[PDB]
Design an enzyme around this catalytic site. Structure first.
Site, PDB file in Angstrom:
ATOM      1  N   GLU A  22       0.836  -1.194   0.000  1.00 22.75           N
ATOM      2  CA  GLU A  22       0.000   0.000   0.000  1.00 22.75           C
ATOM      3  C   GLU A  22       0.877   1.253   0.000  1.00 22.75           C
ATOM      4  OE1 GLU A  22      -3.686   2.039   2.629  1.00 22.75           O
ATOM      5  OE2 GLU A  22      -2.195   0.746   3.607  1.00 22.75           O
ATOM      6  N   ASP A 100      -8.381   4.238   7.895  1.00 21.06           N
ATOM      7  CA  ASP A 100      -9.134   3.246   8.654  1.00 21.06           C
ATOM      8  C   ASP A 100      -9.503   3.791  10.032  1.00 21.06           C
ATOM      9  OD1 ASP A 100      -8.525  -0.298   9.454  1.00 21.06           O
ATOM     10  OD2 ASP A 100      -9.870   1.155  10.387  1.00 21.06           O
ATOM     11  N   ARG A 191     -15.290 -12.997  11.375  1.00 21.37           N
ATOM     12  CA  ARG A 191     -15.214 -12.227  12.613  1.00 21.37           C
ATOM     13  C   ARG A 191     -16.592 -12.345  13.267  1.00 21.37           C
ATOM     14  NH1 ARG A 191     -11.758  -9.840  16.483  1.00 21.37           N
ATOM     15  NH2 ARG A 191     -13.117  -8.444  17.698  1.00 21.37           N
TER      16      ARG A 191
END
Length: 351
Positions: A22, A100, A191
């Site tokens: 990234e 984020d 999750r």
């Protein structure tokens, strides 16, 4: 004008890890913008220079990619420590790329002093005093401000659609009509909690041919509140550059809601899906104002609706093509404002 960019909690050398990749792609897109930029990390390499060998004040702007700053196994993490020391030696405004919600800027000193190895560092060496400007991928600035309320040196906030960096890349390309072998496809990892709920809702017991690639297995969905009988086919992880090609094998690809993004952050995955040969169907909660596509037909609220929309797409190759040309038109038009995107970015870092 010289620019420096670093990742605050992960080493950067090549494409062996997601975060290193990234940072390098961000570096590439900044360069293709006509700016002179260097990536600074732990060691020299094809894409980097070493912290030890540069004067952080030779740079006119220091850009910092967000990350977590926890110490695994209670041991020192050079990536974090070295990055913050570098940032501390900087005497001008710092630019924090906040991509984020979970990774807000954070001082590492308060956690270091309590470690048994605290004698390896001083407060003047780690405490970052320069003012910080948060560049938010999310459009809601109140949320960006609420996450950085624990650090007062963070005085500015501005929104910039950072995640568009992959479609503005020079060598980027759109998918082409692909032979279909699946009805629906979805990528992600398991999750417990609401996520398990959302996944069971849209991908289980649908009667359709659904594939689920990523870090997830049939044995992980056990919550009794979200019972299921038939599950999708789990295929596990894929090569880093296979998202679009993977989605292209299905009539439709799904984006599910998540409180960490909803009506705030548009993700890299949205562009990867929109660029594919699959019709992009979106969970209503993810984008209630339809900022992504202004056509209600691309949005679904629950299982029954998802089944309906997908069967409509299977029985009409005409409807599928039209919706497909509509999402591609949006992408192309967005790629046509590259210059505006670049200028907006330069402006954001005060150039």
């Amino acid at each position: 004008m010289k620019i420096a960019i670093i990742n605050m909690g992960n080493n950067v050398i090549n494409f062996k890890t997601v975060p290193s990749s990234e940072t390098i792609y961000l570096f590439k897109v900044i360069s293709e913008m006509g700016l002179n930029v260097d990536i600074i990390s732990l060691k020299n390499g094809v894409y980097t220079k070493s912290f030890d060998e540069v004067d952080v004040n030779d740079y006119d702007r220091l850009i910092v990619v967000n990350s977590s700053i926890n110490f695994f196994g209670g041991k020192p993490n050079l990536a974090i420590l070295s990055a913050q020391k570098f940032m501390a030696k900087y005497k001008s405004k710092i630019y924090y790329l906040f991509t984020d919600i979970r990774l807000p800027f954070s001082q590492s000193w308060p956690n270091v002093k309590n470690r048994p190895w605290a004698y390896l560092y001083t407060e003047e060496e780690l405490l970052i005093k320069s003012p910080i400007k948060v560049i938010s991928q999310g459009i809601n600035l109140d949320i960006a401000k609420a996450a950085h309320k624990k650090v007062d040196n963070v005085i500015e906030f501005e929104y910039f659609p950072i995640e568009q960096y992959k479609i503005h890349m020079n060598d980027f390309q759109l998918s082409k009509p692909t032979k279909k072998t699946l009805d629906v496809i979805y990528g992600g990892s398991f999750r417990s909690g609401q996520r398990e709920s959302k996944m069971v809702e849209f991908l289980f017991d649908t009667g359709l041919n659904i594939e689920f690639f990523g870090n997830a297995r049939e044995k992980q969905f056990k919550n009794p509140k979200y019972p299921w009988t038939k599950a999708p086919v789990f295929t596990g992880k894929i090569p880093m550059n296979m998202v679009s090609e993977k989605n292209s094998q299905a009539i439709a690809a799904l984006i599910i809601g998540d409180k960490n993004y909803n009506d705030n952050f548009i993700t890299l995955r949205v562009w990867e899906t929109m660029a594919s040969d699959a019709v992009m169907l979106i969970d209503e909660e993810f984008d209630t104002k339809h900022r992504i596509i202004n056509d209600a037909r691309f949005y679904v609220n629950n299982r029954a609706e998802l089944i309906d929309r997908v069967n409509e797409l299977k029985h009409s190759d005409v409807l599928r093509k039209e919706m497909l040309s509509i999402q591609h038109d949006i992408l192309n038009k967005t790629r046509a404002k590259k210059a505006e995107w670049q200028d907006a970015f330069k402006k954001a870092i005060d150039l």
